[PDB]
Amino acid sequence: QLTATVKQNAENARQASHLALSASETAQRGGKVVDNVVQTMRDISTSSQKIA
């Protein structure tokens, strides 16, 4: 019974590692996507001010 839970906890650890690792990479890729928008919002601000 213990071996059944050990392999279960060990198996879930590998599955959770992929989700945790994928979540980290998903945040890094999403971070750059959000950082690029920051420069875009400023460009639109300068563009709007240029129209003024």
């Binding site: 019974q1 213990l2 839970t5 050990v6």
Partner: protein, 51 residues
């Protein structure tokens, strides 16, 4: 798992005492068996005088 190990710990504790009790029976049986050798050796030795 912690609760399961506890059952194994208690199970081992029961075998620990049983193992010690078995040693007494094994040791007592060895001492009792050795006594038969002394008694048996005395019978064959007592009648050894008769050719």
């Amino acid at each position: 798992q912690s609760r399961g190990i506890d059952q194994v710990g208690l199970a081992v504790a029961e075998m620990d005492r049983v193992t010690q009790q078995n040693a007494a029976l094994v040791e007592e049986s060895a001492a009792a068996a050795a006594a038969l050798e002394e008694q048996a050796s005395r019978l064959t030795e007592a009648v050894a005088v008769f050719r």
